[PDB]
Structure formats: structure tokens, C-alpha cells
């Protein structure tokens with residue numbers, strides 16, 4: 058499967074683009090205006106530049122990768138792609154609209170995949186007449202590094218789709234895991250509450266920020282502390298996910314801390330805004 | 338502080354002993370039977386042997402460490418020690434008995450400390466005439482290698498007592514973290530519920546074991562998958578820790594999954610029994 062369409066050119070969409078193009082695939086990134094399309098590819102390039110500098114690739118490796126890539130704002134550009142990964146915007150109404158368009162545009166065998174963290178593959182599937190070829194294919198930031206992809210079956214998802222996406226994953230050297238659609242899949246369901254837990258510990262006067270992070274690095278060999286990890290992932294992302302977990306399950310187990318919610322309202326979202334649980 | 342009594346010669350005690358004695362302290366380890374102590378000192382010797390074979394220390398170093406360790410059956414030898422670390426069983430009635438007894442035996446300045454994972458420092462402190470000198474000082478397995486000690490402050494724990502323990506941990510190469518007593522402190526309050534989540538995920542047929550573990554190792558960069566980590570910590574321990582959290586807080590958020598409760602009744606406790614989530 059040579060040809061892969063990716064909707065969305067932000068941190069995640071672009072990373073995913075780099076991931077496919079770097080293992081042979083041709084990729085078209087699509088967004089709402091050229092400003093964004095361009096900015097992302099820009100960032101891909103910067104990414105490969107840093108890889109050449111670190112002797113992880115050759116200038117030609119790179120120069121080639123970039124040629125397998127092109128931008129656009131027309132969905133219509135997806136008519137010959139074999140895979141679609143939507144990594145646009147975590148809103149159900151729009152995703153339904155988007156998948157209904159691609160149902161129309163794309164060659165009937167084209168599998169349609171979502172990079173959603175929270176929303177229902179099934180419900181998106183339902184907006185098309187190919188529910189059986191609608192799947193979630195969920196990468197992790199930074200997408201060219203992290204080897205995992207959750208392959209999430211919605212209720213109608215076929216075996217054959219599942220297998221194709223599994224093989225496609227193996228072929229860009231990711232490791233796929235089967236998930237039956239359910240709130241937060243596997244990673245987010247564990248990882249974010251962990252971070253939310255910490256915010257409660259913080260809020261409850263139990264321990265200061267640096268002690269909490271140190272406690273998990275050095276007490277549990279974690280690669281980083283949940284607070285810094287959150288500043289990395291983005292507290293808004295984190296709050297959103299806790300909210301979906303809460304809303305999807307009706308289980309108060311997943312309630313966000315008032316603290317987390319206050320930081321996100323402050324706009325202290327972490328790294329990307331120079332400030333969250335820590336300062337930068 | 339040059340002199341530490343370690344109540345308990347199990348895995349945890351023997352490690353705590355090695356941890357103080359390898360960095361200058363005189364240490365006495367005590368247990369209720371001479372076979373128990375000999376084992377512990379054997380554990381310590383084999384370990385020190387490894388570090389020699391690994392050129393991490395010299396043979397001379399080894400002998401020096403050992404010469405700073407004596408074993409005993411006699412609670413009274415603690416009389417003259419600067420610090421007690423209780424690393425015996427995880428039961429409140431008895432911890433109070435032990436702490437009451439050490440109150441009687443020890444010189445007024447002796448600081449009395451508990452390696453507990455979940456239990457109330459305040460409560461244990463309340464069975465003594467020394468509450469200000471009572472604190473938690475929580476190592477992590479294996480004690481000689483892991484650098485965190487959660488230093489758990491009970492309700493009445495003086496600043497003076499805190500600082501000295503703080504100071505004492507740095508002086509043997511650990512990073513101490515200050516913890517105002519609350520259920521599960523920091524590490525377990527976070528880590529154990531993550532394992533419990535794994536179990537719910539598994540219980541709910543969202544994914545299967547190898548997949549849950551792989552997901553966390555490859556999507557989250559954890560050094561081990563939560564289910565295996567359960568098997569190694571011991572499911573009975575994990576379940577207990579979850580019930581403390583639940584009973585302490587009255588918060589449905591820490592309810593343990595039926596599944597975990599079931600496995601424990603099966604005696605499938607993990608490694609130590611040959612079988613937990615995985616087989617061995």
C-alpha cells in the first residue's frame with residue numbers, strides 16, 4: 058500500500074506524515090489553508106535536518122523522504138490514496154463530516170483510519186457506507202520515534218481491515234496492538250489518570266511538584282515525572298482526555314482535579330506555552 | 338548519625354541494611370530467630386560478591402561493609418542506636434507494639450522509622466511517648482540500588498526529626514522526598530492504581546495481557562508492563578494497597594477489580610507463587 062493521505066498538519070499529523078514517508082510510503086498532508094500545510098512540512102524538514110546532523114540519516118535519505126511528500130487543502134487529492142489517517146480535530150460532528158466525504162472520494166478498498174485519542178471509531182464509522190473499513194490507528198508523540206500504534210476496532214470493523222492495518226504498521230516498523238473500542242483504549246486510560254492522580258497529590262498538600270516527579274523517576278524507573286510528562290503532553294490534552302473518560306463512563310473515578318482544570322484555564326498548558334506545572 | 342537498628346531480616350530489611358552499611362554506618366539487623374538473621378546476612382554477602390565480580394567495589398570494600406554489620410535476636414541492642422528502621426510485617430496492632438517497645442528501649446534521641454508502604458505513621462506514632470521522633474522512611478526494592486526514599490511525615494513529626502532523616506538519606510546516596518502522610522503516599526498512590534487499571538482493561542476484554550504490557554512499554558516508555566509489574570510486586574500486595582486507599586479515603590475511585598480479587602483467592606500472586614497474570 059504505497060499511497061497514504063493524512064488529514065491535519067499540526068504536531069501529530071506532521072509526525073505521522075514523517076513516519077510513513079520515511080519507510081517508503083508516498084504521503085499527501087491536507088489541511089484547511091496552505092498556511093498550515095506549509096508550516097507542518099516546514100517542521101518535518103526541520104525534523105529530518107536534525108536527523109542528518111545526528112548521522113541517523115544521509116542527506117539523500119532525507120532529500121528522498123521529502124519528495125515522497127506533498128501538501129494541499131483539497132480532500133479531492135485523496136482519490137488514489139490506499140490509507141487515510143485523520144489527525145485533524147477531536148470533534149465528532151466534524152469527523153463524521155470528514156469521513157462521509159472520503160467515503161465518497163476514495164477508491165472502495167481504501168481503509169479510513171482515525172488518530173483519535175478519545176472519540177468513537179464506531180460513531181465515525183457510522184457516518185460512512187464502509188463501516189467495515191473504518192478503524193482507529195493511534196500513534197503517540199513524537200510519532201516518528203514511538204513504536205506503538207493502537208489499532209482500535211470499532212464494532213463494525215472487519216478482520217481484514219484489522220489485518221491490513223496491522224501489516225501496514227509492521228511495515229513502517231511500529232508494533233501494533235489490538236484494542237476493542239473502549240474509552241481511552243489502553244495507554245491513555247492508564248497514563249493520563251496517573252498524571253491526574255499526581256495533580257491531586259499536588260493539590261492536597263501531600264508533596265511539592267519536584268518531589269512528586271522525582272518519586273516516580275527514582276522510585277518506579279519512570280522515564281519522567283507525571284507532572285513534567287503532562288507539561289510535555291499538554292495539560293489541555295490531559296484534561297480533555299480525563300473529561301472524555303468521565304463523560305464516556307459516567308464513572309467518577311476519572312474526574313479531573315480542580316487543579317488541572319485551573320492550570321488549563323490559566324493557559325499554562327506546559328512546554329508549548331512556556332509554562333505549566335513548571336516554568337520555561 | 339553513625340548507628341542504625343534495622344528491625345527485620347527479610348528481603349527489604351537486608352537491603353536497607355546493606356544500604357546504610359555500604360556508605361559508612363554501623364548497622365545492627367535483628368529478627369526473631371537466628372536462622373532468619375543468618376539468611377539475611379547471607380543475602381547481603383551474595384550481593385556484595387556480585388558488586389566485586391562487577392568491579393563496582395573492591396574485595397576490601399566488601400570486607401569493610403561486612404565488618405560494619407552485626408545480627409541479633411535482642412531488641413535491647415537498639416538502645417544505643419541513632420536510628421531505627423522497622424521493616425517487619427505490615428500490620429498496625431503490631432507496628433504499634435514494636436514502636437511502643439522501641440520507645441522503652443532506646444535513648445531519647447533515637448529516631449524511630451517505619452518502612453511501611455501504606456500504614457499510618459501518625460497512628461504508629463500514637464502508641465509511643467515520642468511522636469515527634471516518629472517518621473516513615475520508605476525504601477524501594479531492591480533497597481541498595483533504588484535511590485528514592487519517601488520520607489513520610491506523620492502529623493506530629495518535628496522539623497528536627499524530618500531534617501535529620503532527610504540529611505541521613507543524602508549521606509548514603511539517596512534522594513529523599515518530603516511527604517505529608519496521606520493514603521498511599523506518592524509512589525504507590527500512583528503506581529498501584531495504574532496496575533489496577535490494567536486489570537480492568539483486561540477484565541473488560543479491551544485487550545489482552547501481552548498487548549497491555551507492550552502498549553505501556555512502547556507507547557509510554559515504561560521499563561515494564563503494568564501486569565508484569567503486578568506479578569513482581571505481588572498481586573496480594575497490590576490488592577491490599579488498593580483496599581487501604583479505598584478504605585482510607587472512602588473513594589470509589591480506588592475500588593479494586595473483581596479480577597484482581599479473584600486471582601488473589603486463587604493464590605495466583607505473581608512470581609513468588611509461580612503464576613499471576615503470566616505463568617512461570
Ligand SMILES: CC(=O)CC(=O)SCCNC(=O)CCNC(=O)[C@H](O)C(C)(C)COP(=O)(O)OP(=O)(O)OC[C@H]1O[C@@H](n2cnc3c(N)ncnc32)[C@H](O)[C@@H]1OP(=O)(O)O
Pocket residue numbers: 069107108111113173174196197198199202245248280281290294556557558
Ligand atoms: C494524541 C494522544 O493520543 C495523546 C498522546 O499522544 S499521549 C502519548 C504522548 N507521549 C507519551 O505517552 C510518552 C512520552 N515520551 C517519553 O516519555 C519519551 O521517553 C521521551 C520523550 C522522554 C524520549 O526522550 P529521549 O529518549 O531522551 O529522546 P532522544 O534520545 O532525543 O531520541 C528521540 C529522537 O528525537 C529527536 N530529537 C532529539 N532532540 C530534539 C529536539 N531538540 N527537537 C526535535 N527533535 C529532537 C531525535 O531524532 C532523537 O533521536 P536520537 O536520540 O536517536 O538522535
